[PDB]
Design a protein around this ligand. Structure first.
Ligand SMILES: NC(=O)C1=CN([C@@H]2O[C@H](COP(=O)(O)OP(=O)(O)OC[C@H]3O[C@@H](n4cnc5c(N)ncnc54)[C@H](O)[C@@H]3O)[C@@H](O)[C@H]2O)C=CC1
Ligand SMILES: NC(=O)C1=CN([C@@H]2O[C@H](COP(=O)(O)OP(=O)(O)OC[C@H]3O[C@@H](n4cnc5c(N)ncnc54)[C@H](O)[C@@H]3O)[C@@H](O)[C@H]2O)C=CC1
Ligand SMILES: NC(=O)C1=CN([C@@H]2O[C@H](COP(=O)(O)OP(=O)(O)OC[C@H]3O[C@@H](n4cnc5c(N)ncnc54)[C@H](O)[C@@H]3O)[C@@H](O)[C@H]2O)C=CC1
Ligand SMILES: NC(=O)C1=CN([C@@H]2O[C@H](COP(=O)(O)OP(=O)(O)OC[C@H]3O[C@@H](n4cnc5c(N)ncnc54)[C@H](O)[C@@H]3O)[C@@H](O)[C@H]2O)C=CC1
Lengths: 341, 360, 341, 360
């Protein structure tokens, strides 16, 4: 194993996305060859560690041109896990490119995740405002919803990816603009799942004034409220009683979290909606994709829109019908009562 | 057809010129008449005095104020209301009120504007006439018991019609669904068009429907239930709402799939892409009740047919369906009152998120 | 096989029910020996037919004192199914007692069901206003919710029953009093599950005025409304969004069926409630335990109370915790999302 | 304790006689005083002018009209309101307003009647004082922002108190739950009493709670969620309602089990027998986040403790629990306004089954 600085590699090369006739998905076409592959994994998890080693071994064996990128602390963790050099000659060790977060962000052509939903969410968030490279997600360890591929098929799947034969689902994201009373500027954060406000530690209910496109919608006194992407419709929003929304639908979900109301039916809003929520009368917690942000005081506001740089997240898909299969087999959608045995 | 007054003449609607499709310049679309507005088709909720009175009053206004305007009504309505006009135009007995009428196909071809006098059902049946063709703009006045869709009080009719004819009105676009019924032992299809919804229901039968649902050629689920509803966003506030569905803005491109009293704890309502291809086949359980008339099919509330085990419906949006391997202006334009009709409608008419009593 | 008239048998002997300390159930104590056993089965169903033969064979073999009662058309159907007489001597054929419905009702000590929920419901309804004998329910064919026993354990279970060692769950029933505008008197019907009003064949919504103990509750415009026992809480009421209510709770459920309202949350009402529902402005169908009754016109009324003759239905229970097990294993209660494989 | 006026004397509540438990002759129970009503404990919503004003006005009325009556308030309240009395009794400077006060245990032993001035929280905290003992009858006046439980406007206080003291009032019985907290590595229990509910919640933690639920010693389910609520019928209109629970009449003997934002499509709310034995153990998933402070426990909204993996709560009704093998007047009596407070409350305060707008 040899650790090298990632700053030796060229900046990210963009892929092209085309919508073929009678497809729900976008063809992933590498206009310049794929080279910079960043691999992230669920930490402190044996199966993701072993799968990473095995995936990198496979890449170094089968794809000389591919440069493997990992985090610094990860490169240290897995260096001892490789023993046999390439084709068993001591002159080709396993080259791991690594460096500061920004260097990785600037150079990544393809993001590969080994783990669950958290792994994808945190990998994608690392990119901040840089357009996100395509995401190839393998499910390892405890199951989540978003990763379509079993690690066992990693060789066949990656071959389709690098050969411009794979297709991607486009997942839209929300932008959260936080405006606190005190200071000058907005803090902007991107959400794959959701942005939510919650009483959290406080025993007192939130009082939220909700505006759509400048028009007052409603006051809600509640545990909180969730604004979700269609991707996020299966996450917190689903727990709170929301509908399941195919990731192909352009929309924003507004789902109340335990409201003092008999009639706050969940809303499905247009993609282009501008949502403003004002904290009315440390009272309220703000979270983006589950990660706590600043605490909000009475008078603070969030402004939420769809992300409009190529926007959104392109995730390699297994089939044209991944969503159907996921809701059935992962979420237990419309499970039949037992009719025999 | 016999008029019940010498002050009314009933004339063939084929005496009128073909429809002038308007322009829609653009979240609301401006309604701008390329050819001037002339042929106004008026429908009303039947057997309700207020709407018959409103129709006569509206037609009187058009005949008084807009000489270029031609009034079209249904044949039975023409006969019904003919005795209600108690004077000719401008006190001149040689200028009777003229009402144009004829068969649907004749009316459909010549309508520039649909005006409805009644409730939600009035709009639904009116638009339903224009199923296989282009729907003219829809001007909807609420009379009698309130519904959700008609944005105007009939009291406002002079000022609203004024704005419409002068090309100063704006419209909300509402999408339409297509239901294709394919009977067991048939390769033909019966096509219907939906503004609200398409639904299957056990109806008169005491036994639950058993329905196999396929999306984009893939099997989704079997449901055993009262039935299932497929709804436009417009229809999200209708049957689908009653069945526990989400409220969907009419600007969202989606199809709702909402179960009706399912034997399941986990049939959460689904929101599907507007591009979806939906097939529902009427099934049964092994050795059973009757296999005929086990399910009723309705489209915008209108019973179509009882269906048998083996029948299928195919449901798609009017435009933009994606057919994955293994499977004329569109939509409806409704004259809007404000740029915020939707939020105000859900709040004031449906009581969306009504606060618990906080004072007094 | 020999067919005999059931009118040769004594009238029904009642069992005694005692609530032992630290039990949820009622001990079934035969004060006079159990003798008259009426067996009913889901019709046109091979497995129930074969199980009936096998159960009767077992009774004639092991319990000389037991008299087997079946329906006339059933006695004809199964007579050919027996071939071997008792202990293979031609002088003891299989004695089947049968006769008119009322004779069976008057003489039954124990009702045995072989089938599903429908079998129990229709067997129990046969008794009209006569107090219902204890019910021993075996699940055969397609699964339903109410029968706690697998037919395979029929010998062990019946031995506990006849030996006064079994325990019963007491299920309460509702009484429906139908008062049509036209005529003089009420038609009274008993419900194990529910009484419901529904638009049925009509495309027009029902308009129902609901009164509790003489006080106006609400007008509902809807597909309909269901009034359910706790037993019925897992039936139609559950499909309509009702809560799952243990059969030990004294209560009446009022669950709207697709109401034109955002705020008709299902209600749980006191056991002693008097519920009156008036049909407001062939418009409305009435069903009791799923069986269509008379059609109702505007101005007709139903009056619904708990049945107050020993009241209710005593069903032989398998364990103290049948309800937990049924909701988990039959209804898929709180099914976990897939966490592995 | 220092009074802020020579017109008020603050006296030890132990100067008063032990409580007189009333009689409850019998769906409402008549409140008939065996010993005459004397010791009136008054609580108010803190830091709200209307309730401080109401307290002074109520106490003034008692002192003017009922010489036999003794007023008990909290120690800090006695000091707070002492400066608010601007005259002595009957203009006699030798007859100051007397306010009795002391520690909870002292107050609890001597209260004939609890009077609350505020909202739902005021009742909850007031009743909470009488946890391990008998709860005196509760007379609840609504001041400030409306809640659900207080049936009387404070304006009505003279006429209502008149009915109560003269043994002409009626009360609704509300049952209480007991929460037994058994810490990990402990065999002792911390007991609390609930009028509304007992709930577990992730609170400050960003991770979901993992809770193992046992009923009557049998494992029911593991839930991964924000949390779970166990509620009385009284509490069915509180947190449980917000979480999607059914509205349960306070005359039904039951315990509600309602999930709070569960990771499941099938955790339908449960209604359990009042006799039920409920145990909930704080679990975790294999190799995880922190194991401490993973869940908050609240009882009637009051945070008790952060709980750790391995802690358990046991929840039972105050009376009538059945313990299947392997596992003083009770309840709360609230003075009622009419024989139909419940139907009127759900309709008028909660907007139960609010009709869509049908006219105007
Ligand atoms: N359901 C609930 O009561 C709560 C849910 N959350 C969700 O956790 C999400 C963060 O995910 P993690 O980083 O894994 O944190 P995590 O491990 O704390 O919780 C996430 C749980 O939700 C699942 N999940 C996440 N995204 C999903 C999606 N799009 N569809 C279906 N299931 C999904 C995960 O697989 C995991 O089971 C937040 O975006 C929020 O939606 C956060 C708080 C409460
Ligand atoms: N909620 C329920 O239980 C049922 C509802 N329906 C609805 O009736 C519709 C047909 O309408 P009508 O001819 O007036 O028959 P209708 O008068 O029998 O039913 C219409 C009821 O639903 C309301 N409605 C209809 N469309 C609506 C919409 N888009 N948003 C909000 N409310 C709406 C109407 O105002 C009226 O109160 C069908 O498309 C179906 O959606 C049909 C059967 C049952
Ligand atoms: N869920 C729905 O949409 C509808 C349900 N029903 C139910 O059918 C019941 C009559 O039962 P059957 O004679 O078997 O007719 P059935 O065969 O037509 O339908 C009954 C279905 O409900 C199940 N079921 C019946 N009682 C149940 C209970 N107490 N708990 C859980 N599941 C139960 C049966 O096993 C069967 O799956 C009626 O009392 C009514 O509750 C009737 C119409 C519609
Ligand atoms: N709905 C929600 O999202 C939450 C509700 N709560 C409720 O707060 C209760 C504590 O009450 P407070 O001390 O006033 O704190 P609070 O003022 O923070 O919450 C009480 C809110 O719930 C209402 N409420 C309380 N009990 C009720 C009941 N039995 N029926 C109808 N409404 C009721 C109150 O009027 C008030 O609007 C707890 O027992 C819990 O049930 C606590 C947290 C969240």
């Amino acid at each position: 194993v040899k650790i090298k600085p990632v700053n030796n590699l060229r900046s990210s090369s963009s892929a092209d996305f085309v919508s073929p006739p009678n497809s729900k998905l976008q063809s992933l076409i590498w206009q310049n060859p794929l080279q910079n592959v960043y691999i992230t994994k669920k930490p402190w998890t044996p199966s993701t560690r072993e799968a990473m080693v095995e995936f990198i071994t496979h890449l170094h064996e089968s794809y000389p041109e591919v440069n493997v990128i990992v985090q610094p602390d990860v490169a240290e963790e897995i260096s001892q896990d490789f023993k046999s050099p390439l084709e068993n000659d001591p002159n080709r060790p396993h080259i791991l490119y690594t460096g500061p977060e920004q260097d990785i962000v600037n150079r990544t052509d393809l993001l590969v995740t080994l783990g669950g939903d958290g792994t994808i969410l945190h990998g994608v968030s690392m990119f901040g405002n840089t357009q996100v490279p395509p995401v190839l997600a393998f499910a390892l360890g405890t199951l989540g919803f978003l990763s379509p591929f079993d690690f066992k098929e990693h060789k066949k799947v990656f071959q389709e990816v690098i050969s411009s034969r794979a297709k991607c689902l486009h997942r839209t994201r929300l932008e959260c603009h936080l405006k606190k009373k005190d200071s000058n500027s907005s803090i902007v954060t991107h959400a794959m799942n959701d942005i939510f406000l919650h009483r959290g530690n406080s025993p007192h209910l939130t009082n939220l004034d909700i505006f759509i496109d400048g028009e007052f919608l409603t006051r809600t006194t509640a545990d909180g409220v969730a604004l979700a992407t269609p991707t996020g419709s299966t996450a917190y929003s689903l727990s709170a009683g929301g509908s399941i929304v195919s990731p192909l639908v352009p929309a924003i979900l507004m789902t109340p979290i335990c409201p003092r109301s008999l009639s706050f039916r969940p809303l499905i809003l247009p993609h282009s909606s501008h949502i403003r929520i004002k904290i009315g009368s440390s009272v309220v917690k703000l979270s983006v994709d589950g990660i706590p942000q600043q605490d909000l005081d009475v008078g603070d506001e969030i402004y939420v829109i769809n992300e409009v740089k190529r926007s959104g997240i392109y995730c390699v898909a297994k089939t044209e019908n991944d969503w159907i299969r996921g809701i059935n087999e992962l979420l237990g959608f419309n499970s039949s009562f037992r009719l025999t045995k």
